[PDB]
Write a protein that binds this ligand. Structure first.
Ligand SMILES: NC(=O)c1ccc[n+]([C@@H]2O[C@H](COP(=O)([O-])OP(=O)(O)OC[C@H]3O[C@@H](n4cnc5c(N)ncnc54)[C@H](OP(=O)(O)O)[C@@H]3O)[C@@H](O)[C@H]2O)c1
Ligand SMILES: NC(=O)c1ccc[n+]([C@@H]2O[C@H](COP(=O)([O-])OP(=O)(O)OC[C@H]3O[C@@H](n4cnc5c(N)ncnc54)[C@H](OP(=O)(O)O)[C@@H]3O)[C@@H](O)[C@H]2O)c1
Lengths: 340, 342
């Protein structure tokens, strides 16, 4: 059996990204069997994740950064969920479902199957393994329980709080016993934070004249913990409102990914307030996954965590949905359905 | 219960840099040489004063509270210093003991909260050292490096404002721990001292380097594990660019930053600290550092100025970089003074 395999390719390096910086192609095929003699796994790709860090990979870097750049002319890759068609690797059998880095394509031959995780709970919707039970959820789990060193009762702020990482941090934090406030870019998202996601309070950053004062309002006694997804002047504001011994988990600074650079002027406050500002990367924490899968599956089962996906249908729509990320167009975790 | 003259330096008023005229020596004041009846207080004859850069901030009025209370116009300047106990109604302090802690810019200070005085346990060390290397500055170095920097033998360490009081000590601590240590300073005379007196593996003049990012690449081909941060600003940008995965930045002081996102990719811990939170560490620190001095395994240069009347100048001087070493003011020599100097 040789079948058609559509692909989305990076046309070329970027210096914001445009939908034209990628190209769907239909003039390609794959054999539905793993090469003889390999330790490899062939996946039918079911779901894709759009993640902001994918932007960086579309630019060429002289010195090595944290992930390999994309190769022009080759498919885009990123997190996704797949079904095992064929396998010459012992830990994976035909009919198993998995998640991990795969190609923006209908079918991927995974030469390094050590970096695929087997899906242990079929009871759960498979798309969850793009986000809440995939990379994004684990990011939240590490960022909050580990980097933020939280303590019950502490005052927690979360930027980009309706996003995939944000919405999870908030719920983790409320269930730990913290006061949790979120910021987002639309009243629809703010509504979701207060009504679906259980946030003690939230507000629209686009519709607040002074971020520093806005935060003073929700944190009269200042902020103990800032889960940082956005960066820029929102960080300055937070710094102004941080409490002695406050902690900032630097998850991302998405405001800067396509800009060029914006400056932070408050940093000296980190001294007077004895703040720990610490970045982290989820790739370093895959060891914590098994415990995390169990915690979060139970949380879902018990209806004690909520999760909103933004779903887009068809591989052809993946470039748009990725670009859309950066303009706030996603309402929840951006997933692309390749086949169901 | 004699009454004597007590000269004082007062803050005339709040400042919006400071001038010598923003302070005033006065001779009118007097003091009883006995702690009030019923108090648990300690009366000091003030021997030495420290000039420290953070004093500048206290000369400005702050609407919102910052880390230490502002100075009060009309009241003496206060800061770290060394004193001899004249009288005490507090059990842990006796007449003739020497101590350091916050005292007044004056000949005599009545200390109402003596829990924040540290006893001097080695009176054979020059007492002036307890302004700086064995006082607040040294401890700042001790905690900043051994604690906040979480160092490990062999790691590549950078220190800004390295010829300063804190910097100079961080560097030596770091060398003796087994680290490669490079310093930055603002004059070739200071760079010379870092390499020849202070034991730094390398150093350079930041004023005479066009690109700090490249400058640092040069001394750290494999990047920086640890940055002891005294300066801030673009020097921080540069460092961040040369930091290694899992690198650590101890924010001691700073005197816009655009590359903060790097903290994520490189998994950096940037952590501020304040020495007031670490007084518990003093006793162990005193022992380590005294031995280090006794064994001639740490070096230290003081800039000494004589007389209370010169303190304002020396503090201003500090802020314009004019001090060569830790800036001390001699208010009065302990009876029986016999330490040589230069
Ligand atoms: N291991 C890691 O370090 C790790 C792992 C995963 C994610 N991340 C980081 O986490 C952040 C969010 O991840 P996610 O997958 O959950 O993304 P997401 O929040 O689901 O999508 C991006 C969101 O960011 C907000 N946004 C976009 N541009 C913005 C701007 N210029 N200013 C303010 N807000 C903006 C938008 O919400 P608004 O409507 O609120 O504007 C948008 O919904 C990103 O910074 C990403 O790099 C890091
Ligand atoms: N607990 C704490 O967190 C704590 C405690 C004590 C001190 N500190 C801080 O540590 C820093 C200095 O402490 P210190 O006692 O050692 O003071 P100091 O270094 O004796 O005085 C500051 C020195 O920094 C250098 N400098 C000034 N502007 C600079 C710039 N723009 N770039 C680079 N270097 C510059 C000057 O010499 P060169 O320009 O020639 O290098 C100057 O002598 C200050 O920020 C101070 O507040 C913090």
């Amino acid at each position: 059996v040789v079948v058609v395999n559509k692909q989305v390719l990076l046309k070329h390096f970027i210096p914001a990204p445009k939908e034209t910086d990628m190209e769907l192609v239909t003039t390609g095929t794959i054999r539905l069997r793993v090469p003889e003699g390999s330790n490899a796994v062939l996946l039918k790709n079911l779901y894709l994740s759009c993640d902001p860090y994918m932007r960086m990979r579309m630019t060429k870097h002289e010195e090595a950064s944290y992930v390999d750049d994309f190769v022009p002319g080759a498919p885009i890759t990123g997190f996704g969920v797949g079904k095992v068609v064929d396998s010459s690797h012992p830990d994976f059998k035909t009919g198993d479902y998995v998640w991990g880095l795969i190609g923006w394509e209908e079918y991927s031959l995974i030469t390094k199957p050590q970096g695929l995780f087997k899906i242990h709970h079929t009871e759960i919707p498979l798309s969850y393994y793009t986000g809440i039970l995939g990379m994004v959820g684990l990011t939240a789990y590490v960022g909050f329980y580990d980097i933020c060193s939280p303590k019950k009762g502490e005052r927690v702020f979360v930027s980009a709080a309706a996003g995939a990482v944000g919405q999870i941090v908030g719920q983790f934090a409320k269930q730990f016993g913290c006061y949790v406030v979120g910021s987002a870019g639309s009243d629809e998202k703010v509504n979701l934070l207060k009504t679906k996601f259980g946030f003690d309070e939230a507000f629209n950053y686009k519709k607040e004249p002074d971020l520093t004062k806005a935060l003073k309002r929700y944190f009269p006694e200042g902020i103990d913990i800032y889960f940082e997804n956005v960066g820029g002047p929102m960080l300055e504001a937070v710094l102004h409102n941080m409490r002695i011994k406050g902690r900032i988990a630097a998850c991302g600074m998405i405001s800067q990914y396509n800009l060029k650079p914006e400056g932070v002027h408050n940093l000296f406050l980190i001294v007077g307030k004895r703040i720990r500002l610490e970045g982290f990367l989820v790739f370093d924490h895959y060891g914590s996954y098994p415990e995390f899968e169990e915690k979060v599956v139970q949380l879902i089962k018990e209806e004690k965590i909520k999760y909103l996906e933004d779903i887009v249908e068809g591989l052809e729509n993946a470039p748009a949905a990725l670009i859309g990320l950066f303009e706030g167009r996603n309402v929840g975790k951006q997933v692309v359905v390749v086949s169901r």
